[PDB]
Amino acid sequence: QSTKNETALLVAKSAKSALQDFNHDYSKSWTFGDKWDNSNTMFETFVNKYLFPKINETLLIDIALGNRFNWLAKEQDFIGQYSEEYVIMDTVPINMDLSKNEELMLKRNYPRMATKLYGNGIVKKQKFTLNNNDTRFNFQTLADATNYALGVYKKKISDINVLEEKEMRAMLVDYSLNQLSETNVRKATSKEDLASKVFEAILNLQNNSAKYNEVHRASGGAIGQYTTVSKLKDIVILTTDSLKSYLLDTKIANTFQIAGIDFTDHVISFDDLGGVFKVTKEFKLQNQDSIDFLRAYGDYQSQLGDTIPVGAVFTYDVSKLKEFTGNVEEIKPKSDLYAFILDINSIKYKRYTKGMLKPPFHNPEFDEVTHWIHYYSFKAISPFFNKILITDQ
Amino acid sequence: QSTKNETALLVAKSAKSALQDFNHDYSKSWTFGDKWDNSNTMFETFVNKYLFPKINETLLIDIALGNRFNWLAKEQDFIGQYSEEYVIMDTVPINMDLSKNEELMLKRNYPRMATKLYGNGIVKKQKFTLNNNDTRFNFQTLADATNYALGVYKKKISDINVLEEKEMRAMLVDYSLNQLSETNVRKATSKEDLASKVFEAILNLQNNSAKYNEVHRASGGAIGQYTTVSKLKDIVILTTDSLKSYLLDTKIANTFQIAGIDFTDHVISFDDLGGVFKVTKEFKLQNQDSIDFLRAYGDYQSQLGDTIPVGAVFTYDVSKLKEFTGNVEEIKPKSDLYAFILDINSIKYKRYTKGMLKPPFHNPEFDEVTHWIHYYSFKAISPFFNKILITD
């Protein structure tokens, strides 16, 4: 519309703004003052129609976002780069007989040692710039400015948790879709059939069986067997919310919950699995709209002409931009009746959060300091534990 | 030389690696793991053929590498730039010619002189950046990483010291070859002749001799003479190592009256005293492999297009590059039969090492710390003392 209001014309006069004094190397020095009227507009009180509108409160809403897999996180010393692991293969006890060659007492019997070698993690970073002169214009107390400087920092702590939780639930779906053997994969037909298969596959763990681990794709576990058991204190179902609302809605969940394990807290579920994307073709960055889209989510370091390798992850919705279409797929389970039952010790996850406040660079030209947050996180998944995937594929 | 071994194909996959995690803005963020098999490889053992091999031991050999010139170092203040020295040139007496007119008394005969204006030295610089992200992917003990961070720092001072002796050596040799008189040079013919011409070049430095110095290269001394002696507690002989070895094993060990005439207390010696290069013709930098060759010796700041002035000094073997041939000549004697017998206190050498360890710059974007080392070193040779060169 259009407004011929005496106060709205004063409001919309942008040549008087504070931004004019900070986007020009020479600017206005002394203030004459302004006539402020609250008549026949908003901000109008019944008494004293000539005062400036005043703030009752300003409220920093700071939500503590949590990583649900944080109790799995071991902490290492960030030294070397290859973590390896190994088991001892089964040798079943044999009957003894007193009528043998009796120089087989001299014979040897070594253990057999299935292993697997893991690479490194990656170091991740994020920064935030806080200045000292222009952000003071909009808090009216020192306490609100310090709460702002602290809320920015705790948001930078919280989105690390969001990143790591979304990253690990992308790992556990990428694993089961692509890398997992089709011996651990059971196939369902309908939702009640899948519920009965999930509830019999929980009970297919806690059993001394060499059938449910992928020790055959360890380095030395191709011949022989390796028997794994799993308690119920370390079994986790990873599924969707539309299917957790059906698994918990059965009488078997009630008899698990009564006098026993908390079955609500062993079923880790999400809305539908995957907001994380993968790169399949090594592309480059060509357009400014994609650069600004990456700047919106805090990715400051990437510029035009940067190449993205095959297998890089993004952790937000990227596939709508012109040069990402086709080059980028999604870690999303096919035929969303989906449940992946694992032992929680299979997630080999360790970090290094020792010294993640690197000391600030001041930049006293603009008086805008910058704090960086560096952390090393190693995400892997071990083959020596019971895993079952129940899909319709 | 083609290998189809599966562990060698696992090692040959450069897509899985620490490098493409640290080259790109985005990378893979989890590891599924790889089947490592030690069978039919260099890493194979008998009982367990499936583990990754182990280091127990990681050494860091270190050496301190002293200077052999820093008794000559005068700790200056590093203020002002132009230093000067002078002598008063010799005026011989003349005969009393009484037939000249008597107003010869009123004419003034000012004492003439010979100066030499030196100038500034060179502020010299080196730095080293230690990483906190990818250096820690090596060094399986934290003690080894701290030993590394210290050994780099202690190597920087070692190749300050060897650089300063290379520059003192090259200063003396380049001053022997390009500046001198016709009087100062001698021509030896062999190793047995030079070891006696050195002995008879001493006993010539300590005569009242208007020759043997280079005041004709001083500012006011182009016409006139200047006499100087030495004291034999001030004479330095700069030879190669073959000549000092020859003296000590042959000439001393084949004489009986060695109790008086041993001059090897005054002899510094070098194994090969040409390795340092100069510039002629004033080129510039245009080739990529040349600056990649320069980066290996620590010179980080040179880009392409940078020009090199007509008197710069390179201090390592540099004449093989594509740009530098014809422009760069080596400071060396052409015969390996060499002796420069000069006076000490003809070699001024003032370095300044006070504000030297400058405070570091933590670079937390890349999580790294750069340390700098700065020193100001002035080195020069005075033209007012006795010098004799013996070469071919």
């Binding site: 990583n67 944080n70 996180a73 010393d77 790591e164 | 230690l130 030993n147 202690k154 933590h362």
Partner: peptide
């Protein structure tokens, strides 16, 4: 093992690792 002047400026203390104080929020 060999110290000399081991605890030098910021990097020689940065490998002698520093201040596990802030960890991630859940546990």
């Amino acid at each position: 093992m060999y110290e000399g002047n081991n605890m030098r400026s910021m990097m020689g203390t940065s490998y002698e690792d520093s201040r596990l104080n802030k960890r991630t929020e859940l546990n």
